[PDB]
Amino acid sequence: IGEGMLADFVSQTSPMIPSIVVHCVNEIEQRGLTETGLYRIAGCDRTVKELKEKFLRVKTVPLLSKVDDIHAICSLLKDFLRNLKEPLLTFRLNRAFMEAAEITDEDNSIAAMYQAVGELPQANRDTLAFLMIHLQRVAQSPHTKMDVANLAKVFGPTIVAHAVPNPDPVTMSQDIKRQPKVVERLLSLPLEYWSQFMMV
Numbered sequence: 001i002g003e004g005m006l007a008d009f010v011s012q013t014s015p016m017i018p019s020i021v022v023h024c025v026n027e028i029e030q031r032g033l034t035e036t037g038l039y040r041i042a043g044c045d046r047t048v049k050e051l052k053e054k055f056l057r058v059k060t061v062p063l064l065s066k067v068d069d070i071h072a073i074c075s076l077l078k079d080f081l082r083n084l085k086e087p088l089l090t091f092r093l094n095r096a097f098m099e100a101a102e103i104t105d106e107d108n109s110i111a112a113m114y115q116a117v118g119e120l121p122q123a124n125r126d127t128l129a130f131l132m133i134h135l136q137r138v139a140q141s142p143h144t145k146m147d148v149a150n151l152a153k154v155f156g157p158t159i160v161a162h163a164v165p166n167p168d169p170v171t172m173s174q175d176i177k178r179q180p181k182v183v184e185r186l187l188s189l190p191l192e193y194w195s196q197f198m199m200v
Helices: 019-031 045-057 070-082 094-102 106-117 122-140 148-160 169-187 191-195
Strands: none
Touching: 019 045, 019 070, 019 122, 045 070, 070 148, 094 106, 094 148, 094 169, 106 169, 122 148, 122 169, 122 191, 148 169
């Protein structure tokens, strides 16, 4: 359940963002921005599984307002993203993103980051844009006690992940050290830059 490519969960109508991602974000923005540890604290797996099956197998929109613990919604969103056949930033651009984020000169790093985003398939680009705008708001909220650095650590394994389906143990440890900076860079890009992909 939910183990397919990002594109399987959206049409080619812009913005190309899966409904599950939009509904989760809307719920989280309404009652999660006041909660400490947002995206760090895990919700009940039983709830995550039930919601996941309704969204992806039954293909209906479950009533998220009925879910008492908003952390289960954060868990659902992370679970959906993390279990895609390939990560949000794709296998093809995994290394490109890490290398871009590693350029010593900041403006040069930012330029390489923009070039990489420009290479993403549309679904990935639009979903990433939507997610970044949302996470900036999570960092911006003083109630979540989650800053850019913390969010980058949570989402590094979630959206950057690895360059291959079955990376060796050592390479995995090396990838994990490099993921956070990629997300920190992405979260720091201009709101207007990301927003342009939302207005169509």
